[PDB]
Design a protein around this nucleic acid. Sequence first.
DNA 1: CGGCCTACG
DNA 2: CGTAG
DNA 3: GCCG
Length: 326
Amino acid sequence: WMPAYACQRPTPLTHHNTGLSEALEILAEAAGFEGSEGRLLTFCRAASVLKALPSPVTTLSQLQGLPHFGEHSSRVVQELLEHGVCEEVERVRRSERYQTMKLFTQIFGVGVKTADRWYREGLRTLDDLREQPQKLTQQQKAGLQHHQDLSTPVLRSDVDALQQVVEEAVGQALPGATVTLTGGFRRGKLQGHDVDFLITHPKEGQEAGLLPRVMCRLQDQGLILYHQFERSFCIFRLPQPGSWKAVRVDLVVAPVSQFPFALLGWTGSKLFQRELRRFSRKEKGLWLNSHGLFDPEQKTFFQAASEEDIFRHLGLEYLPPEQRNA
DNA sequence: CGGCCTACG
DNA sequence: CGTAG
DNA sequence: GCCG
Ligand SMILES: [Mn+2]
Ligand SMILES: [Mn+2]
Ligand SMILES: [Mn+2]
Ligand code: NA
């Protein structure tokens, strides 16, 4: 009754197994810090299954037959049901390795591989990094300078103000171009780490060269604290009562022919899209990315005019963005 | 056992 | 290497 | 870590 792929089931933003899913996601995150993408995926998938259930898991028997629940994930749930805590999870939580890798990878410009190298060098704190700026890229310097603001959640009220300033710049750069909110806010989140926008133009080809023109205009308005094509990963100045704060903003351009694929990809969730691409390739023999959907036997691309088209071409029931919170 | 999403900057 | 969902 |  529970399909194996996250793109085969609705997953709402809020659900009935929050504590259980959180614990499994700690173990997933820890596996990622150790470079075990397979273990990360299984724990992420198990967590996602619980988010899709219609009511709370109260007894171990309710895990029977659920996909991605084997001995390990089942034992985590068992311990949480019986004692309210899982010793493995708590050991990860308090571990110096987990805490430091989490802190370092949160920095814009720092990935698992950099964080791990710094950890092995003995570094543990942000001030450790600041007192050695020669070891840092300009991207990492920006991420470290702005880390405090970037650690503060973006609110949906922030988002609407940002969208209007992006629209004004986009309108000067190319009249008729449009701006669509994507990412977690499109899935209904009330908060986020960043804001994602997708830009296109109704006349195919008119979007060529657009993003540099948009960025130059935002920079001239004094709004860009950091940036640097079709993707721009920025830090923006956002107004605040009597001051401002730094906010991560991603700007993406797509031709209108590819817009449904780009919208689908950039709306996420991350696990939803990995699962959708995995389903496409393994179950349907089609190759999906944010530009299109390729049939490698006919050597043809599927034209899509909507996200609904894409779900139909993959043989999946349509899920609105609010149900893609895998 | 092999596989685990698939891009761009 | 970083970034994205 | 789990599916197939
Ligand atoms: Mn986002
Ligand atoms: Mn983003
Ligand atoms: Mn993301
Ligand atoms: Na990072």
